[PDB]
A = this chain, B = another copy of it.
């Protein structure tokens, strides 16, 4: 397992930490949403949570990443939820296909289910 500290930024001013595919994946529109493995695991820094979003270059090439929330204390594998929009898309292993953005976790008095 690899932790989020292993992710890299494109540039010092990049908001997102890039996430790569651990497998070669081919997606077609009729497949619908697929969960792609990253080999990167939570949890996140104290008092933060995450959002998974598409990289703009990847979105423009027709692979939609559905926004995902990563809880502060999630310790499982971060997966990228993705769909080929209207053409066949091919994801080569190790290609950066999404990004993790970190956001402050606001506390409230809402109850637990």
Contacts and interface: CB of A to CB of B under 8 A. Distances in A.
A7 B110 contact: yes
Interface residues of A, number: 57
A88 to B, nearest CB: 12
Number of copies: 3
B15 A69 contact: yes
A24 interface: no
Given A9-B110, A45-B108, A106-B48, A66 B86 contact: no
Interface of A: 4-5, 7-18, 29-30, 32-33, 35, 45, 48-49, 51, 53-54, 56, 59-60, 62, 64, 66-74, 81, 83, 85-87, 99, 101-106, 108-113
